Amino acid sequence: VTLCSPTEDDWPGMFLLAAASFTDFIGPESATAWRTLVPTDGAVVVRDSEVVGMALYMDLRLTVPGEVVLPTAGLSFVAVAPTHRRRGLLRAMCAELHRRIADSGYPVAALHASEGGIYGRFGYGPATTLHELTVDRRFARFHADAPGGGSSVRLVRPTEHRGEFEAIYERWRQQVPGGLLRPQVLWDELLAEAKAAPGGDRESFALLHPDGYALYRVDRTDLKLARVSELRAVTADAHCALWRALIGLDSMERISIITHPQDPLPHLLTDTRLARTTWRQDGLWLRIMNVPAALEARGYAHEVGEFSTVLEVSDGGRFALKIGDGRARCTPTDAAAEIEMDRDVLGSLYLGAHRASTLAAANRLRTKDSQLLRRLDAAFASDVPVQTAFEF
Amino acid sequence: VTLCSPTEDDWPGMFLLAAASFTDFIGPESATAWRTLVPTDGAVVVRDSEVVGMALYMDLRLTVPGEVVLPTAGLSFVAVAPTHRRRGLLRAMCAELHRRIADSGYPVAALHASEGGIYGRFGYGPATTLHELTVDRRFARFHADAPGGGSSVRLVRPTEHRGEFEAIYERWRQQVPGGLLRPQVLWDELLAEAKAAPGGDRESFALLHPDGYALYRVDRTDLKLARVSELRAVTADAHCALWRALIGLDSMERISIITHPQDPLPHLLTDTRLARTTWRQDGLWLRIMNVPAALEARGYAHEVGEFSTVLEVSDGGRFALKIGDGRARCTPTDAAAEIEMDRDVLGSLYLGAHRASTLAAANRLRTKDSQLLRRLDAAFASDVPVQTAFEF
Amino acid sequence: VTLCSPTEDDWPGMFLLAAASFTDFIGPESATAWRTLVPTDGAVVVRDSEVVGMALYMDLRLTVPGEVVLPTAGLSFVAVAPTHRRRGLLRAMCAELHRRIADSGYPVAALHASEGGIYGRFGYGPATTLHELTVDRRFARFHADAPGGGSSVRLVRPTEHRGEFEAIYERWRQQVPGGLLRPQVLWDELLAEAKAAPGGDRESFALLHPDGYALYRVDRTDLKLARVSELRAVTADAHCALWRALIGLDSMERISIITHPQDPLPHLLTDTRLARTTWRQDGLWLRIMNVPAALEARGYAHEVGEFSTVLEVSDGGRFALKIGDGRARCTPTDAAAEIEMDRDVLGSLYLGAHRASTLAAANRLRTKDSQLLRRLDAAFASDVPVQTAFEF
Amino acid sequence: VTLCSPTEDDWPGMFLLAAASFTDFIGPESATAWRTLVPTDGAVVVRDSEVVGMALYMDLRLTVPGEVVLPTAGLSFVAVAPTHRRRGLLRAMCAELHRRIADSGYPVAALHASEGGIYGRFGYGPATTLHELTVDRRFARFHADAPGGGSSVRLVRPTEHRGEFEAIYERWRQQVPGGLLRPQVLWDELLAEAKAAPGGDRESFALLHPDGYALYRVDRTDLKLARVSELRAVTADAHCALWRALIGLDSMERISIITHPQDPLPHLLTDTRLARTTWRQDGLWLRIMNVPAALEARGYAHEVGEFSTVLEVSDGGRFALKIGDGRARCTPTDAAAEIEMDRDVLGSLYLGAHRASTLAAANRLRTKDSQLLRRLDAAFASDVPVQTAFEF
Ligand SMILES: COc1ccc([C@H](CN(C)C)C2(O)CCCCC2)cc1
Ligand SMILES: COc1ccc([C@H](CN(C)C)C2(O)CCCCC2)cc1
Ligand SMILES: COc1ccc([C@H](CN(C)C)C2(O)CCCCC2)cc1
Ligand SMILES: COc1ccc([C@H](CN(C)C)C2(O)CCCCC2)cc1
């Protein structure tokens, strides 16, 4: 077993491992479009020869609180052959890619986890929360207060309005923590999946507003369920107008969407309970590669007064952290730690999805000052709720 | 149709309406113990004679942020006969009880809603969130950081340790927003439901720690599911120790609990995803009866700097609101409103369960200042997460 | 194996066979109340000794078209031990009871069939149709035309209004084909089943109108389903008023009832489709014991002009049948048959539930005259739709 | 929003609205074959431009009692964009098409309803009843009386016997109320759907008798269920022979068919209960456009003696109605009404599927004469049971 950057010759062995590892694997042509986002030296393989392990990262741009955009290494396509389990292949592949990612100057790495038990030990913390809402649209009535009581929304074919979707998404990704730049190859892929497949997905339709769009398709087996694959709204008016149109799908019983915990939809209805939470899971995981670069790069809440503390990340350094006027300064120190946590915990705090107080109650974050805990909670809170852009 | 305080003679007609209206109705003897909490003039009936409508409130004590305890009117036992629907009976009964509640000096009313679409129009807003977590305990391993790695926890018969449960709950209710005083008749009722019933519930067991207790019973139909009816933990150590014991129920596959969104349990595990959110619904609803008395009574976040605004509640007054050093002053004004909302929206903000920004995005809260929105969000936030005490 | 009238000593052996044969068997005390309706010589047993077969009939009064009431032998409690199958016990028991029934002067026998394949060969034809309607009452709105848009309906405890139920049912049974006299022991039994059982049925409630009553109970497992056990309405106004009250059970999702195919309920609603047919099965089976006495006793449709034919029942005689002015005369003849059918087919025609044309299309009824078929269809039609009274 | 006859340019916008509105939408090529049946001026669109509403009618021939064939406007392809709900688009489109249909000389309009609550208010009444029968063919034995105890039935490929299917269906449609002429484009469509689809329907087979045919296919998911899409039998012998062959599908557990309430199948079996009613819904809806032309065109039952009455249709005229010798005369009058009903109720009576007495019991039909009700019931009854031809 040796660990190497793959040559062109390795890619069929990687596609075989992929097919056998990932049921969602569309196939070589689709993976060749995601390959464009992978830099030179972005991939490792383990050969025994034949490919028994692989892992890569893609070049991404991730929006963090304060509308700051970070270069982000997106780990993906990670697989160990079922023949080579418990041989330390994952550990060796993650250590090598992390070395390259850190040396390349990325302040943050990110991934979507296939199981919740794997990535904590490599320093990844769950940083966004997926929340499925299912609306029984037969009972749904809009509240007297809800905006937009002509329609500004049009029912359209997605492929005929690519430009408008691209422009609305670009505005949304820059203003929302969790937003990711979507490269044009990923618009190619998205619009190809919109098409219906024999024995596969049904055709996707779009609802298009000047300041938002919703992409939806009827479920293959449940013909009374419409699944919203993506709703991007830049204004509250756009969000309400799009939900008025979705609730107008009179041939459906139910509309489902994978959204975020602060989605205002339930509050648009006279019965908030009609927007049922049917599923809840971790979305984007973060590994802070460079603690000072990450902490200094994001914006903090202006509401909390200036405060100074000493933060120790387990095997990640100790820092004098001063937060004031929405900005952090984070410098080396050997002064006594006032706060300690593993690297994964910092990733979970970083976008505002998890409260320092919640993590402290599990002893994942350790402090003897409850006042400092309240200050951390308030300062790391995000004004714009954190959302999940697209899986990678 | 006349509306009156019931006489002793009305109570059998009320118990008949109850039996026909509420499947959860245990029976007259149980309802006679809840009757003790109902003050003189706490009940209304509509006669046609026979009882075709009823509603009452109970005298409760509700903990709000800052560990402040308010006298609270708990509306319950509300029913209209299926023979007298759409005759305005509910509207007439709610108006009369609200008049009595306000005249009696209660700053707040509260209820548990049988449907989500009814109570908004009478000024009640959902104020707590029930979150069911189901753990697949066969995979559950505690994180290296989790506290308590002899056991301080004992498996006991609930009826033999009444004193210790009473004392732990008393400490928990005073320190937790949402906490309710539990009167001794309600301890009588709770310990009677612990007993097994032929063709009914299985026997309840307790796990008892010096600083917490968990009451649980195996599901009647699912013999591999244990349902935690109540876990009250005064310290993080007590919470972790109790979950170590629950995960040690080796004959179960699954442990379920109705908890709150900030329950630290998922963070105690190496796989956070094992604590699945299987259900989510509104818990306690609040109607603010007296806006200035309620706003002045609770504590606010010390992190946010002093600020002044003008709040209009639709048909509930306009107030100069000044929040500083964790305290509010709320005085009459005819100055221009900077914030407007219906009374129900204020109830939803009051315990910290809903963000002003979230309600603003649905246009339930109206302001032209985004800075004021961030300040309201931060100030109404609760340091101790809001929990739901017990249904009434 | 001998066949005898049971002595008092045989009854425990019969109750043992009953318990082992009938899952619906309430027990000896309940069966001892049904025993009162069984005449001297109304029962047979086969001993091997131990009881290996039994069958009995009860003295009933059955309403047929024209509001005519016939003495009816109600066969029931029919069982062969699982140890003595395929020994001709059923055939021997049915032949003996039929001999006694015919000799006693009963023009008709009736039963409720545990399977559809058994009773045709002994001359029983299905004569009524059970139709389960399930209403999704959350969508149900009454049509502008529906009657009864104070309520004349009261929600009551069944046991407190026995007299009123008895009187309404007496009026309904006399005016409805299929009606059966309900003896007071059967009112005792009905009101005992109204009571809730630990691990059993939930309590029954009644809706009481001057001209109808509905008995209903929440399903033991489905707490959002109310099952109407019995709705007896003497007027259309009573029927509509009772359904307005049932649709007002706001805590239920669904109301189900076992009714008849001509129940007007669907036509009371703006959406007829909301009253879904979820189940359909044979109800009351008839064996015509004496062809001329039965055909002469019922009323026929006044719309059809006088006509004469010759009817042959297979092994049941040949008759000159003259139908005019709503009356039949049915006399012996050896003239050529114009219509032939097995005895079971006549039972199926007798109350109007099945069309002669439908049975002719299956060749269960044989004629070469299509005009005679149309005349039979029209003449045997019932003005008041046929309903099923109560199982026996 | 303007309302217009579509130009060729509007049809892609209509196909987009169709795809988004109808999950059963096969696609443009299939809809272009149904377009042939749509006359010039048979279609309306609402533009906002883009298509936000559409509705059309097709030229059909409908068989009514007496084997009379009426020109019938078949409304279909009716959709409002989910963006333009509650703007009166349906009302405006139905009013315009009804104006054109009436002016064109159609005595009747018809449709298949996607929901039961929409079409009553535009004067459409449900006129046929779909009844799904599911037979457990493992228990099914034919009665000694059933016809056809060599087989006259052949198992064939539908596409190889098009001529014979066309000829049998032509005979059946002319002799059965509810029958519709099937144009050759609809035979093209039917035989194309017979072919199997990858990830779609399995191949269809036919059973062919000189006087009937059955088209059936194994269910895609349930491989032990055969679904009969269509059984057309001109004689009872053909019906019995076809069911003998279907019950001979020894690899199936269950045969299901969508038939009519008077299907003789259950009576062909020794156990009638084996032919279970698993589904029941409205089939064809009728709007009587011209009351006198429709009432005069159909045949009436010869059994009922001559009678005269005065019928008022709400906003549809008042008529002296004389029914005798199977014929009606229906002339204008201002004499006092003896019978009143909304137009939709007349459509429900017109083919014999609903009894005047049943509609009277719901107060949809109003009279003070019970004798007149019995006469209407008998006269509007259909000798040949009403069946549903094919959906449009
Ligand atoms: C060649 O590099 C990649 C990277 C990612 C992908 C896929 C992205 N999907 C979200 C469409 C993936 O789904 C990632 C998980 C493993 C299967 C393939 C493809 C190629
Ligand atoms: C007589 O006053 C009351 C008030 C409340 C109750 C019950 C409380 N449960 C939580 C045990 C209730 O469950 C409230 C909802 C309606 C049914 C009865 C009883 C009597
Ligand atoms: C002793 O005679 C009888 C006759 C009938 C019964 C019961 C009647 N039920 C409808 C309550 C029966 O249900 C009939 C079927 C067999 C089981 C008992 C009892 C005793
Ligand atoms: C272009 O005109 C029409 C009319 C009807 C149809 C379809 C007929 N099916 C029964 C095959 C329809 O199914 C009707 C309901 C809406 C979807 C399409 C097609 C085109």
Q: Where are the alpha helices (DSSP H) in D22-61?
A: 28-35
Residue labelled with tokens 């179960």 = B252
| D46: closest CA of chain A, how far (Å) | 13
Chains C and D touch (3+ CB pairs under 8 A): yes
A115 known ligand binder: yes
d(CA A362, CA B250): 23
**Same structural domain, B75 and B139:** no
C239 with D120: Cβ contact below 8 A: no
User: Could you tell me how many helices (H) and strands (E) chain C has, helices first?
Assistant: 10, 19
User: What pairing do the DSSP bridges indicate for beta strands D68-80 and D108-111?
Assistant: parallel
CA dist list (Å): C284 to A375, C125, C214, D349: 78, 9, 21, 29
Residues C78-110, buried b or exposed e (16+ Cβ, 10 A)?
A: bbbbeeeeebebbeebbebbbebbeeeebbbbb
Which of A8, A77, A182, A188 to mutate for ligand 1's pocket (most ligand atoms within 8 Å of CB)? Answer: A77
Chain B residues within an 8 Å CB radius of C245: 82-83
Domain boundary among D287, D302, D336: D287
d(CA D311, CA D314): 10
Domain-located, residue B223: yes
The structure tokens listed for A16 are 């075989």
Tell me which chain A residue has its CA closest to the CA of residue B262: A358
Phi, then psi, of D361 in degrees rounded to 5 = -65, -25
CA D164 to chain centre: 23
A205 with D19: Cβ contact below 8 A: yes
Which residues have C-beta atoms less than 6 Å from ligand 3? C 18, 22, 24-25, 31, 34-35, 38, 56, 76-77, 391-392
Direct distance between the N- and C-terminal alpha carbons of chain D, in angstroms, rounded to an integer: 28
d(CA C284, CA C388): 7
**Same structural domain, A338 and A243:** no
Chains B and D touch (3+ CB pairs under 8 A): no
Question: Which of D106, D119, D122, D169 does the annotation list as catalytic?
Answer: D119
B23 with C207: Cβ contact below 8 A: no
Residues B320-346, buried b or exposed e (16+ Cβ, 10 A)?
A: ebebeebebebeeeeeebbbbbbbbbb
The structure tokens listed for B22 are 């509420």
Q: Is C392 a catalytic residue?
A: yes
Among A115, A237, A244, A273, the strongest candidate for a mutation testing the B interface, having the largest count of B CBs within 10 A, is A273
**Same structural domain, D108 and D233:** no
C155 with B19: Cβ contact below 8 A: no
- Using a 6 Å cutoff on CB, does residue B34 contact ligand 2? yes
CA A212 to chain centre: 19
d(CA B261, CA B239): 15
Residues forming beta bridges with residue C287, ordered by sequence position: C109
d(CA C119, CA C123): 7
Neighbours of D24 (CB within 10 A): 8
**Same structural domain, B210 and B298:** no
A78 known ligand binder: yes
User: What H or E segment, with its residue span, contains residue A191?
Assistant: helix A184-194
**Same structural domain, C185 and C314:** no
Domain-located, residue D391: no
Size of interface C-D (CB pairs under 8 A): 135
Domain span at residue B111?
Answer: 1-127+283-287
Contact A133, A275 (CB under 8 A): yes
CA dist list (Å): C332 to A278, C102, C311: 74, 18, 10
Domain count within chain C: 3
CB neighbour class for D233 (10 Å; exposed up to 12, middle 13-18, buried from 19)? buried
Phi, then psi, of B300 in degrees rounded to 5 = -120, 165
C271 with D374: Cβ contact below 8 A: no
Which of B14, B22, B34, B390 to mutate for ligand 2's pocket (most ligand atoms within 8 Å of CB)? Answer: B34
Domain-located, residue A38: yes
The structure tokens listed for A203 are 């055709």
| B15: closest CA of chain C, how far (Å) | 11
**Same structural domain, C132 and C263:** yes
The structure tokens listed for D18 are 């169709």
Amino acid making up residue D303: E
Sign of the Cα torsion C10, C15, C18, C19 reads negative
Q: How many angstroms does the Cα of residue C116 sit away from the middle of ligand 3?
A: 18
Work out which ligand 1 atom sits closest to the CA atom of A391: 10
D353 known ligand binder: no
Diameter over CA atoms, chain A: 68
DSSP E strand stretches across chain A: 2-4, 43-47, 51-64, 68-80, 108-111, 125-126, 129-136, 154-156, 205-209, 212-218, 225-233, 254-259, 275-282, 285-288, 307-313, 317-324, 327-332, 339-341, 365-367
d(CA C358, CA D383): 11
Domain-located, residue B45: yes
d(CA A90, CA A43): 13
What is the DSSP code (8-state) at residue D216?
A: E
Residue labelled with tokens 């497992």 = C221
DSSP 3-state assignment of C69? strand
Chain C residues within an 8 Å CB radius of B85: 248, 250
D102 known ligand binder: no
Chain C residues within an 8 Å CB radius of D361: 236, 239, 264, 267
Among A205, A218, A221, A250, the strongest candidate for a mutation testing the D interface, having the largest count of D CBs within 10 A, is A250
* Helices B184-194, B28-35: inter-axial angle, 10-degree rounding: 150
Q: Which of C273, C301, C304 sits opposite D282 (nearest CB)?
A: C273
d(CA A252, CA A224): 4
> Please, after which residues is chain D broken with C–N above 2.5 Å?
48, 149
Contact A186, A390 (CB under 8 A): yes
Work out the angle at residue A279's Cα, subtended by the Cα atoms of residues A278 and A282, and round it to the nearest 5 degrees: 160
Q: Which of C264, C270, C282 sits opposite D272 (nearest CB)?
A: C282
Domain-located, residue C389: no
Among D114, D128, D242, D273, the strongest candidate for a mutation testing the C interface, having the largest count of C CBs within 10 A, is D273
Strand order in the sheet with A212-218: A154-156, A205-209, A212-218, A225-233, A254-259, A129-136, A275-282
Identify which of B299, B259, B270 has the alpha carbon closest to the alpha carbon of residue B381.
B299
Work out the angle at residue B28's Cα, subtended by the Cα atoms of residues B25 and B32, and round it to the nearest 5 degrees: 110
d(CA D367, CA D302): 23
Size of interface A-D (CB pairs under 8 A): 48
d(CA D94, CA D118): 11
Domain-located, residue A390: no
Which residues have C-beta atoms less than 6 Å from ligand 4? D 18, 22, 24-25, 31, 34-35, 38, 56, 76-77, 391-392
**Same structural domain, A140 and A83:** no
What is the DSSP code (8-state) at residue A47?
A: E
Among D267, D307, D314, D354, the strongest candidate for a mutation testing the C interface, having the largest count of C CBs within 10 A, is D267
CA dist list (Å): D305 to A162, C122, C308, D302: 72, 39, 18, 7
CB neighbour class for A21 (10 Å; exposed up to 12, middle 13-18, buried from 19)? middle
Q: Which of A157, A218, A248 sits opposite D83 (nearest CB)?
A: A248
Domain-located, residue A90: yes
Neighbours of C18 (CB within 10 A): 19
Tell me which chain A residue has its CA closest to the CA of residue B265: A362
Identify which of C212, C202, C215 has the alpha carbon closest to the alpha carbon of residue C258.
C215
**Same structural domain, B123 and B263:** no
Phi, then psi, of D252 in degrees rounded to 5 = -100, 155
**Same structural domain, D374 and D350:** yes
Q: Where are the alpha helices (DSSP H) in chain C?
A: 11-21, 28-35, 89-104, 162-175, 184-194, 236-247, 291-297, 343-350, 356-361, 370-380
**Same structural domain, A153 and A266:** yes
Q: Is B213 a catalytic residue?
A: no
Q: How many angstroms does the Cα of residue A55 sit away from the middle of ligand 1?
A: 11
Q: Show which residues on chain D lie within 8 Å of chain A, measured between beta carbons.
A: 16-17, 19-23, 48, 50, 80-85, 114, 197-200
Tell me which chain C residue has its CA closest to the CA of residue D117: C271
In sequence order, which residues have a C-beta less than 8 Å from that of residue D286 and are 6 or more positions away?
A: D108, D109, D110, D124, D125, D127, D347, D348, D350, D351
| D329: closest CA of chain C, how far (Å) | 19
CA D269 to chain centre: 27
Residues forming beta bridges with residue C63, ordered by sequence position: C69
User: What H or E segment, with its residue span, contains residue D324?
Assistant: strand D317-324
**Same structural domain, B163 and B269:** yes
Question: Which of C119, C169, C213, C380 does the annotation list as catalytic?
Answer: C119
Query: What does R_g of chain D's alpha carbons equal in angstroms?
Result: 22
- Using a 6 Å cutoff on CB, does residue B392 contact ligand 2? yes
Resolution (A): 2.1
Question: Which of B77, B106, B119, B124 does the annotation list as catalytic?
Answer: B119
Contact C191, C157 (CB under 8 A): no
**Same structural domain, D173 and D117:** no
Residue labelled with tokens 């927003």 = B177
DSSP 3-state assignment of A71? strand
Contact D55, D41 (CB under 8 A): no
The structure tokens listed for D184 are 């050759």
D78 known ligand binder: yes
d(CA C354, CA B100): 64
Domain boundary among A244, A267, A282: A282
Identify which of C136, A265, B132 has the alpha carbon closest to the alpha carbon of residue A255.
A265
Domain-located, residue D265: yes
Chain D residues within an 8 Å CB radius of A246: 82
CA dist list (Å): A390 to A186, A192, A205, A240, D138: 10, 16, 18, 22, 52
Residues forming beta bridges with residue B51, ordered by sequence position: B47
Which residues have C-beta atoms less than 6 Å from ligand 1? A 18, 22, 24-25, 31, 34-35, 38, 56, 76-77, 391-392
Residues A345-356, buried b or exposed e (16+ Cβ, 10 A)?
A: bbbbbbbbbbbb
D361 with C117: Cβ contact below 8 A: no
Query: What does R_g of chain C's alpha carbons equal in angstroms?
Result: 22
In sequence order, which residues have a C-beta less than 8 Å from that of residue C202 and are 6 or more positions away?
A: B23, C196, C217, C218, C219, C220
d(CA D392, CA D387): 15
In sequence order, which residues have a C-beta less than 8 Å from that of residue C105 and are 6 or more positions away?
A: C71
Domain boundary among B258, B287, B316: B287
B271 with A115: Cβ contact below 8 A: yes
d(CA C264, CA D354): 10
B262 with A146: Cβ contact below 8 A: no
Work out which ligand 4 atom sits closest to the CA atom of D18: 17
Contact B139, B271 (CB under 8 A): yes
